[PDB]
Design an enzyme around this catalytic site. Structure first.
Site, mmCIF file in Angstrom:
data_model
loop_
_atom_site.group_PDB
_atom_site.id
_atom_site.type_symbol
_atom_site.label_atom_id
_atom_site.label_comp_id
_atom_site.label_asym_id
_atom_site.label_seq_id
_atom_site.Cartn_x
_atom_site.Cartn_y
_atom_site.Cartn_z
ATOM 1 N N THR A 99 0.859 -1.208 0.000
ATOM 2 C CA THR A 99 0.000 0.000 0.000
ATOM 3 C C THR A 99 0.885 1.244 0.000
ATOM 4 O O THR A 99 1.732 1.356 0.899
ATOM 5 C CB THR A 99 -0.956 0.014 1.200
ATOM 6 N N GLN A 100 0.712 2.124 -0.984
ATOM 7 C CA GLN A 100 1.454 3.407 -0.973
ATOM 8 C C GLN A 100 0.638 4.383 -0.128
ATOM 9 O O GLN A 100 1.235 5.291 0.473
ATOM 10 C CB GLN A 100 1.652 3.917 -2.400
ATOM 11 N N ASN A 101 -0.679 4.176 -0.077
ATOM 12 C CA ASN A 101 -1.572 5.061 0.714
ATOM 13 C C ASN A 101 -2.413 4.215 1.675
ATOM 14 O O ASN A 101 -3.381 3.587 1.212
ATOM 15 C CB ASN A 101 -2.453 5.919 -0.197
ATOM 16 N N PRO B 284 4.898 -1.793 -0.042
ATOM 17 C CA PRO B 284 4.882 -2.213 1.360
ATOM 18 C C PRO B 284 3.541 -2.631 1.968
ATOM 19 O O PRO B 284 2.530 -2.147 1.520
ATOM 20 C CB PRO B 284 5.308 -0.910 2.052
ATOM 21 C CG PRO B 284 4.742 0.180 1.182
ATOM 22 C CD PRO B 284 4.954 -0.342 -0.221
ATOM 23 N N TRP C 76 1.513 -1.838 4.860
ATOM 24 C CA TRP C 76 1.509 -0.810 5.934
ATOM 25 C C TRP C 76 0.994 -1.436 7.228
ATOM 26 O O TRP C 76 -0.195 -1.276 7.526
ATOM 27 C CB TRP C 76 0.653 0.384 5.504
ATOM 28 C CG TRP C 76 1.206 1.730 5.851
ATOM 29 C CD1 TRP C 76 1.123 2.376 7.049
ATOM 30 C CD2 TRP C 76 1.907 2.617 4.963
ATOM 31 N NE1 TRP C 76 1.735 3.598 6.970
ATOM 32 C CE2 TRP C 76 2.225 3.774 5.703
ATOM 33 C CE3 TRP C 76 2.300 2.544 3.622
ATOM 34 C CZ2 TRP C 76 2.920 4.844 5.144
ATOM 35 C CZ3 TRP C 76 2.985 3.602 3.070
ATOM 36 C CH2 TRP C 76 3.288 4.736 3.823
#
Lengths: 240, 247, 229, 239, 232, 233, 233, 212
Positions: free
Chosen positions: H1-3, H105, H107
């Site tokens: 997840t980037q966000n 990644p 998160w």
């Protein structure tokens, strides 16, 4: 007559007379199971009666079936090698799903038959695989053509029929049907089941009992494929 | 599967490629195709094999094919394979004109096709192309040139050559009739009728049974022209007159 | 995976027997006839079913490729269905690029290319079907034949399948360069009739016609009229 | 030469490579499976070839999922391969649909992989037949057997191996539909002991597994105590 | 991809496909190469003159690079493939090392390719043997031979193709410091060697010479006739 | 009929057993390991006087401390000697140390049996290598000589003869080898046994000899030094 | 006849002759014995010298601190399997930081060795292996076969004249569990000897010993290190 | 997840004599909004290991399915071997690093607590592959509000009982409710011991005092 030169009878290649013996031997596999299937279309109904042979009392008979639902409104009766048959039932079920997803409407029974016959032809032109030894008789209700009985074969040949038969007594059943349809057709009416039950009964000299046969039906009123229960099949058998 | 494989790309106990030899036998049963180089131009004279009366003439030629604006070829063998090789020859010519912006030299085009033919004879597991082509053309390095290629992928430049049925007899007559350095397209279009009148044992040349194409340079432009049946009939007539005069 | 070796190879006499055998399957096919008249082309085929239990209007032997191009065949109908699909896809690829109906000659060459591949590719047999393509382009009628080898021929009149040699002899004595599609339809029915064995009916035969209007398949009713005369 | 590839039918419509593959399963010791009302009990006659073999070597009863168990016959290497396939099919079903795979679906999917080895010359048909059994509150007890051809059917009592026919006669003398797993385990042991031929087949270790309301829908090996009571009943019955 | 093993060992340890390739080389025209002191000479038998055939198109002596040139016996189509691979290699070498390839460098590459075709799936050995002749930068005349097996050796003089044994027997008894002192004597040695096999004499014998720091020279038919008469 | 990887009823692999027969047709090569170093000798087997004897390379250097004697299909060896040289240089680049002779012999012996036609790889080998190798070198363990065969099997040999006359030089080798033998005595013993098996008369141009010694690097004896030993022979 | 050249062809009697042939290769290898106590698993290997001047070959190998293997059959195929086993053990200690259970490794080898027995153009593995390892389940001795089947063994012997050893092991197996390492190692040496050509003895040159236990990482005792164990028989 | 999307807050851990205890709030927040207030961010990996996660809840739902199958896969072999609490921690470090190196990644900061061989395990794993073992663990704002208190008690008294550990966890949960704006007053406490992993239902720090 039966001239051979090379692997004409081991792989799918033309004989000195252009015959393709391997496909011919795949039609001998359909009769290795020992069961016969009959499908008749009426004015507003299509029926697929097949012979059910549960050899052992230890086998769950609910699992021993040749009638299949490709889609809610398309039904199939498979004759020949059981494992090859379940393979084509799966390819039909998938091709029917991919069709609605890409086109937005249910596949016509003629279009499912052509797709399955096209895949079957590739087994006749390539030598890496054997043709499948199974025949599929599909039944459905077309919105503009009504009852539809279509059959595809291990060679890639598909055709629509007023009434058809596959298996060991295909020839005798054909003759039985190729006389009733000539007189006035498989007497159109949901009681077209009687023609099919009597065709299979006559060719396979036997008074079927509610548990010795399986009947699938599609109707203009109820277009969804339905497998009749022993009680429903018994009603028809008692009627005749 | 090793059992069903024919092993086309392999040698024989005597160092021979039999698929290539068998394909060459096929070429020797096809319509005679003769090529003659003259000082003023080059000519290809093929024997029409499609001579049924219910056949429609719907093309420029059946055996001759233009591959460039300065090159043309006739084929002897399997027609289907010739269609494949002629399409590849046309692309090789266009690919060269793209990279250099000049027409492809003739021997360079023949070498490219023969390299493809030779590859089907060494690796792949597939049969060779049963087609021998006679190529005619003009370049600014060697001028008017005639070449012959075989299913082996082996090519050679010639002053006069024949491929197809009764080809050996033709090469013999061309050998005793071709005058190197003294051949004009008139004398070239004359020896063609003479050789065809002997190679094609089927009666006498009938114009409908033969196709004749000529490549010449006119005002800095290469012009390929298939002689009309009227012209071919006049040629066959003159040959008959000459033979009778010598009798 | 699959076999990568050619199943069709050269024989010591310089012949590819597998294609010769595919032509045997084409000669054992039901009789087919094509006649190029001055105003159109008629493609007629014998379509006799084994029984009265077959829906004759279910599967067709005369099939449209574009709107000006139509095809008929003699040999293995399953192999024909493969070539009909490829012909239609090749015809559409042409329109997508040149935005014009594909010339009939271009279609026959492109289809003949696919057929030749099945004679030199690996693990595959040649197509056991000879095709008769009719097309109208540039205000001219075109009739071409395609052999299992990949060889294509332009014809004014031709017959394939059982009794094709006797049929071609009949067409040679009856065909006239100055004919109309209506006269051509009669001669095509007569050619099939010579080698039919039975009563030609609006459902025992299938006819397709190409004209300036385009290709179409004569309805059983329209064929009923022609058979009457 | 019509019997050297599975891509070839005989001049009679038969693929003899698949018939030869099933001859291998008929040359193996018998594995019996009986479905009751409480679930399913599997039993295998594991012949011990060498006395230098630890107990449990070459086991023929596998756990393909928490709820599914697999009895096997024929080549153990091929059988272990199909157990991996069944274990992977069940895992992907739980990851895609998010629940325990129905045994019919697991059977159908494994049977299709088996049938894919009966069509090409590049591969040989599997030389093993197996029975998959499970028990859930919604579906109940289920017993399915798959053959080298790839045919799957559900049974109330199946027997694969060299003594399938004799074992079937014994299984057919039982009212499994009314019996419970605790009572079936002794009957499975009795049949495996009655079908075993000591004169030829030397010695064997009775292997017993079950899945049912008693195991709470979990395939497991019958507790040693219950297995021992069963073997004592089995030997005593043979008398 | 077709991946069958064409070249496989046989009982007795014989790769017959490689032996069949050498049979094709024995059916090829005779090629002779003599390594002199300041001149390397390569001569080939022009089997049949053909009369109606441009000779510029059927030349069996080629130049892989400015310093190297080769003659071949066996299949002409396989040779064209090998010559083109070696020509491209010589240029790739000049680009990655900025120097002319050595005669043995290119002989090693041509041999290594001719070898991989004998141990690779889907390929048949090349039916050609070559005579790579050139001058190393040091100025040493060089003569090497390649076999369809990928084996390569340096020679003072050799013969490949039909009548190789007869010609090599002749060169074995006629090669000496005497018959190599003069460039003309070196040329007439190759001429006499071929004349032992060539029946026509002069008319059917192509010949080429590559002197030091000079391009390959194809002797004109008249020049060849001059030596043929002097050698008579 | 049978593919490259088919076992015999005796379970031996036919292609690997025909490649061993291929070696029996090679020039005899003798290898002796002594405390003072390893000597590798081979028979050039010249065919014609017009051939250049120097072009026949049967003893090659994998590295300054490792040499190799080959017998059988020499062209097949080229690829195997290339792997040995690259593996030694890769070991230097990665660990900054000389590779042991057993590690080089193990790296090459691994390429053998890596053959097949079932799409094993795009550039997969089609058949076994018809060559036997005698690797001689000096590692942290001292002078070491290993022998590799077309079966992918490598062994440490004190004295080994490979080639056509191995079934005779090995008998002669087992009658003249003593662990205390010196390098000079070994070098003379190699030439004596080779002169016996060699069909031609052993000279300083028809044989190749090389030696790896604890301190000195792989050394191919020149005609002058060969002539001296051949004088005593 | 036509049922014994491919591994994808069942015989009319349901048997793949090619697997039966590959299984013959192991029976054509030097005998290797393997037994386990309650705490130790010992592998005794009868090394075989190609000649009087050749080292035996090395039949015992290291896979991980807790696992070691004795080889019978093609050594090249053995090295290929040994590398697969070594990597699978490295992967386990890299992801879970735990020694790979010995039983689980045997499952992976049987899966890798079964694939080549059902694919056209592929050969069965021609190596029989006796695996010795220690784990949270105690000492384990396993035997792998070219057929891809494996067996958990209390004691086993694979190779030539290995039935003589299996006879000794079956007779004395009862006392192996409660045995000291030296008593256990000597039991194995006695069985390996029962597989020796009548007039032959177990010298320090023809014998190798590999041992693993609760406090001992797999160790291969060779040369003089075998003298302690041999002295006392 | 980037966000990250729906996320969870701090997860606590403390090793005592006889096992370990983890505590997490039953809340998933959508950037300030308490959107899902009855979710468990604790999981029973096996009978000896438990897992609590902070960060993206869909990334935790992915780990629960992958680790859940990994355990079912092992328990089907019947070999007598099982993944230990430390082996599960090693796999998670390898998984988080593998994803961080691919720049995709997960998160999630996880606390792995386990009990095996009479030894208590408490390991920390972040999304970048940073992992360590310690007597106490506090992810998120517990690193600044709860860990200080746990570390003070675990310094004077190195070994805590189950009664002491639970008391301190419930005390640190109250301070996290008073000062963490992404916290919630409903929490679950999981305990791993020789009996196995037990998770307690919705517990409340309702023992909150508000003298304002």
């Amino acid at each position: 007559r039966g001239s051979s030169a090379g692997f004409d009878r081991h792989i799918t290649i033309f004989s000195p007379e252009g015959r393709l013996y391997q496909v011919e031997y795949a039609f001998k596999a359909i009769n290795q199971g020992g069961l016969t299937s009959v499908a008749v279309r009426g004015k507003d109904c299509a029926v697929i009666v097949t012979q059910k042979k549960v050899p052992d009392k230890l086998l769950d008979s609910s699992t021993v079936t040749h009638l299949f639902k490709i889609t809610e409104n398309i039904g199939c009766v498979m004759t020949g090698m059981t494992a090859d048959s379940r393979s084509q039932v799966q390819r039909a079920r998938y091709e029917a799903a991919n069709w609605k997803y890409k086109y937005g409407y249910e596949i016509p029974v003629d279009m499912l038959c052509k797709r399955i016959a096209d895949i079957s032809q590739v087994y006749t032109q390539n030598a890496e695989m054997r043709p499948l030894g199974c025949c599929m008789i599909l039944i459905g209700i077309d919105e503009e053509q009504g009852p539809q009985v279509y059959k595809c074969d291990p060679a890639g040949y598909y055709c629509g029929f007023k009434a058809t038969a596959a298996g060991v007594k295909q020839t005798e059943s054909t003759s039985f049907l190729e006389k009733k349809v000539k007189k006035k057709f498989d007497w159109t009416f949901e009681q077209t089941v009687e023609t099919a039950i009597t065709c299979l009964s006559t060719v396979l000299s036997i008074d079927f009992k509610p548990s010795e046969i399986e009947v699938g039906v599609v109707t203009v009123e109820n277009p969804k494929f339905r497998i009749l229960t022993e009680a429903e099949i018994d009603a028809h058998l008692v009627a005749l | 599967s090793r059992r069903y494989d024919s092993r086309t790309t392999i040698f024989s106990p005597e160092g021979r490629l039999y698929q290539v030899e068998y394909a060459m036998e096929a070429i020797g049963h096809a319509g005679t195709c003769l090529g003659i180089l003259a000082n003023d131009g080059v000519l290809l004279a093929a024997e029409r094999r499609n001579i049924h009366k219910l056949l429609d003439e719907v093309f420029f030629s059946e055996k001759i094919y233009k591959l460039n604006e300065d090159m043309a070829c006739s084929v002897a063998g399997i027609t289907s394979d010739a269609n494949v090789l002629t399409n590849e020859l046309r692309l090789i010519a266009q690919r060269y004109l793209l990279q250099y912006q000049e027409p492809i030299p003739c021997e360079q085009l023949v070498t490219a096709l023969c390299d493809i033919k030779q590859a089907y004879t060494q690796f792949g597991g597939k049969r060779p192309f049963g087609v021998s082509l006679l190529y005619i053309g003009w370049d600014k390095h060697y001028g008017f040139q005639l070449y012959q290629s075989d299913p082996s992928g082996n090519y050679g430049g010639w002053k006069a050559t024949c491929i197809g049925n009764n080809s050996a007899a033709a090469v013999s007559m061309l050998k005793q009739d071709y005058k190197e350095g003294e051949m004009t397209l008139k004398s070239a279009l004359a020896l063609a009728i003479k050789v065809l009148n002997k190679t094609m044992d089927v009666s006498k040349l009938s114009a409908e049974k033969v196709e004749i194409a000529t490549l010449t340079r006119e005002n800095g432009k290469t012009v390929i022209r298939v002689l009309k049946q009227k012209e071919v009939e006049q040629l066959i007539k003159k040959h008959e007159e000459e033979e009778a005069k010598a009798e | 995976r699959g076999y990568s070796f050619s199943l069709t190879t050269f024989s010591p006499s310089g012949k590819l027997v597998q294609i010769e055998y595919a032509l045997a399957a084409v000669a054992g096919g039901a009789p087919s006839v094509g006649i190029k008249a001055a105003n159109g082309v008629v493609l007629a085929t014998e379509k006799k079913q084994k029984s009265i239990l077959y829906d004759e209007r279910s599967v067709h032997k005369v099939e449209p490729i574009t709107k000006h191009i139509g095809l008929v065949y003699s040999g293995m109908g399953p192999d024909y269905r493969v070539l009909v699909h490829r012909a239609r896809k090749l015809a559409q690829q042409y329109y997508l690029v040149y935005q014009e109906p594909i010339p009939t000659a271009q279609l026959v060459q492109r289809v003949a290319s696919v057929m030749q591949e099945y004679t030199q590719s690996g693990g595959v047999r040649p197509f056991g079907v000879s095709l008769l393509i009719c097309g109208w382009n540039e205000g001219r009628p075109y009739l071409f034949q395609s052999d299992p080898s990949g060889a294509y021929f332009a014809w004014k009149a031709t017959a394939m399948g059982k009794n094709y040699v006797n049929g071609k002899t009949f067409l040679e004595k009856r065909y006239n360069e100055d004919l109309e599609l209506e006269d051509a339809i009669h001669t095509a029915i007569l050619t099939l009739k010579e080698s039919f064995e039975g009563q030609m009916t609006e459902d025992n035969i299938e006819v397709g016609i190409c004209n300036e209007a385009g290709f179409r398949r004569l309805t059983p009713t329209e064929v009923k009229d022609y058979l009457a005369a | 030469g019509y019997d050297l590839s599975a891509s070839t039918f005989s001049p009679d419509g038969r693929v003899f490579q698949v018939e030869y593959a099933m001859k291998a399963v008929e040359n193996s010791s018998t594995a019996i499976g009986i479905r009751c009302k409480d679930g399913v009990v599997f039993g295998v006659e594991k012949l011990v070839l060498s006395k230098l073999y630890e107990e449990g070597s070459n086991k023929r009863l596998f756990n393909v999922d928490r709820h599914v168990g697999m009895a096997v016959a024929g080549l153990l290497a091929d059988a272990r391969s199909l157990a991996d396939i069944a274990r992977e099919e069940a895992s992907n079903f739980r990851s895609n649909f998010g629940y325990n795979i129905p045994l019919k679906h697991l059977a159908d999917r494994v049977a299709m992989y088996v049938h894919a080895y009966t069509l090409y010359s590049a591969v040989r048909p599997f030389g093993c037949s197996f029975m998959l059994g499970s028990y859930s509150v919604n579906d109940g007890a289920q017993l399915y057997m798959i053959d080298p051809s790839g045919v799957s059917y559900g049974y109330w009592g199946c027997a694969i191996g060299k003594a399938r026919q004799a074992a079937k006669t014994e299984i057919e003398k039982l009212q499994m539909k009314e019996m419970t797993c605790r009572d079936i385990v002794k009957e499975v042991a009795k049949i495996i002991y009655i079908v075993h031929d000591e004169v030829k087949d030397k010695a064997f270790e009775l292997e017993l597994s079950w899945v049912g309301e008693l195991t709470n829908g979990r395939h497991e090996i019958v507790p040693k105590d219950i297995r021992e009571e069963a073997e004592k009943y089995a030997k005593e019955s043979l008398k | 991809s077709y991946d069958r093993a064409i070249t496989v060992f046989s009982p007795d340890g014989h790769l017959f496909q490689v032996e069949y390739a050498q049979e094709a080389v024995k059916k090829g025209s005779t090629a002779v190469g003599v390594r002199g002191r300041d001149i390397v000479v390569l001569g080939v038998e022009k089997k049949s003159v053909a009369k109606l055939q441009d000779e510029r198109t059927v030349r069996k002596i080629c130049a892989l690079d400015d310093n190297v040139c080769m003659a071949f016996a066996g299949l002409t189509a396989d040779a064209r493939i090998v010559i083109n691979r070696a020509r491209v290699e010589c240029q790739s070498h000049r680009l990655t090392v900025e120097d002319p390839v050595t005669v043995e460098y290119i002989t090693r590459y041509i041999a290594s390719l001719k070898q991989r075709y004998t141990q690779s799936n889907g390929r048949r050995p090349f039916g050609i043997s070559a005579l790579i002749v050139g001058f190393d930068f040091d100025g040493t005349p060089r003569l090497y031979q390649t076999d369809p097996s990928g084996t390569y050796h340096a020679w003072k003089a050799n013969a490949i193709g039909r009548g190789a044994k007869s010609v090599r027997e002749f060169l074995e008894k006629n090669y000496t410091d005497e018959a190599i002192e003069t460039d003309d004597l070196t040329i007439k040695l190759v001429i006499k060697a071929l004349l032992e096999v060539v029946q026509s004499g002069g008319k059917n014998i192509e010949l080429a010479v590559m002197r030091r720091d000079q391009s390959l020279k194809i002797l004109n038919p008249e020049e060849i006739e001059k030596y043929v008469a002097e050698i008579e | 009929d049978r593919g490259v990887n088919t076992f015999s009823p005796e379970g031996r692999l036919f292609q690997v057993e025909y490649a061993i027969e291929a070696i029996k047709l090679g020039s005899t090569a003798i290898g002796i390991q002594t405390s003072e170093g390893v000597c590798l000798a081979v028979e050039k087997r010249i065919t014609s006087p017009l051939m250049e004897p120097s072009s026949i390379e049967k003893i090659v250097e994998i590295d300054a401390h490792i040499g190799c004697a080959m017998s059988g299909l020499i062209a097949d060896a080229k690829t195997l000697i290339d792997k040995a040289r690259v593996e030694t240089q890769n070991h230097w680049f990665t660990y900054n140390e000389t590779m042991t002779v057993e590690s080089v012999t193990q790296a090459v012996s691994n390429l053998a049996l890596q053959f097949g036609e079932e799409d094993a790889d795009p550039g997969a080998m089609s058949r076994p290598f018809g060559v036997a190798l005698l690797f001689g070198g000096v590692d942290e363990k001292g002078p070491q000589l290993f022998h590799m065969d077309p079966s992918g099997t490598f062994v440490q040999c004190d004295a080994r003869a490979i080639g056509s006359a191995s079934e005779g030089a090995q008998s002669s080798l087992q009658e003249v080898y003593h662990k205390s033998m010196t390098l000079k005595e070994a070098i003379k013993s190699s030439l004596i046994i080779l002169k016996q098996v060699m069909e031609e008369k052993l000279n300083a141009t028809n044989i190749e000899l090389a030696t790896v010694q604890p301190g000195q690097n792989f050394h191919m004896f020149t005609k002058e030094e060969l002539e001296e030993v051949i004088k005593d022979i | 006849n036509q049922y014994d050249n491919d591994v994808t062809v069942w015989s009319p009697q349901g048997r793949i002759h090619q697997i039966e042939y590959a299984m013959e290769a192991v029976k054509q290898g030097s005998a290797t014995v393997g037994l386990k106590s309650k705490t130790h698993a010992v592998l005794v290997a009868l090394k075989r010298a190609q000649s009087e001047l050749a080292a035996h070959q090395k039949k015992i190998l290291h896979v991980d601190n807790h696992i070691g293997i004795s080889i019978a059959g093609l050594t090249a195929d053995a090295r290929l399997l040994c590398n697969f086993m070594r990597q699978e053990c490295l992967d386990s200690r890299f992801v879970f930081d735990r020694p790979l259970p010995v039983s689980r490794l045997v499952s992976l080898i049987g899966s890798k060795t079964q694939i080549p027995t059902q694919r056209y153009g592929r050969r069965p593995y021609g190596v029989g292996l006796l695996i010795a390892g220690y784990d949270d389940m105690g000492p384990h001795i396993f035997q792998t076969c070219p057929s891809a089947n494996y067996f958990d063994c209390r004691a086993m012997s694979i190779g030539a004249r290995s039935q003589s050893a299996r006879t000794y092991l079956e007779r004395h197996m009862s006392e192996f569990m409660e045995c000291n390492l030296n008593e256990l190692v000597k039991h194995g040496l006695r069985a390996l000897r029962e597989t020796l050509p009548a007039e032959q003895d177990l010298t320090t040159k023809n014998v190798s010993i590999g041992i693993v236990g609760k406090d001992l990482e797999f160790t291969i005792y060779d040369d003089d290190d075998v003298s302690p164990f041999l002295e006392g028989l | 997840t980037q966000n990250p999307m729906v996320t969870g807050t701090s997860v606590l851990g403390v090793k005592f004599e006889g096992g370990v205890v983890i505590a997490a709030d039953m809340l998933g927040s959508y950037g300030s909004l308490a959107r899902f207030r009855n979710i468990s961010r604790i999981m029973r990996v096996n009978n000896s290991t438990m897992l609590g996660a902070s960060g993206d809840y869909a990334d935790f739902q992915y780990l629960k399915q992958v680790l859940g199958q990994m355990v079912i896969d092992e328990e089907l072999l019947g070999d007598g071997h099982s993944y230990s609490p430390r082996a599960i921690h090693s796999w998670l470090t390898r998984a988080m690093y593998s994803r961080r190196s691919k720049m995709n990644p997960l998160w999630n900061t996880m606390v792995i607590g386990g009990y095996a061989d009479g030894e208590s395990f408490l390991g920390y794993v972040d999304m970048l592959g940073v992992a360590y073992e310690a007597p106490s663990l506090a992810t998120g704002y517990g690193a600044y509000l709860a860990q200080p208190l746990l570390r003070e008690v675990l310094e004077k008294q190195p070994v805590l009982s189950q009664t002491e550990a639970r008391d301190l966890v419930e005390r640190c949960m109250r301070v996290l409710y008073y000062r963490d704006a992404r916290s919630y007053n409903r929490f679950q406490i999981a305990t791993v011991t020789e009996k196995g992993v037990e998770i307690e239902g919705p517990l409340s720090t309702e023992t909150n005092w508000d003298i304002a």
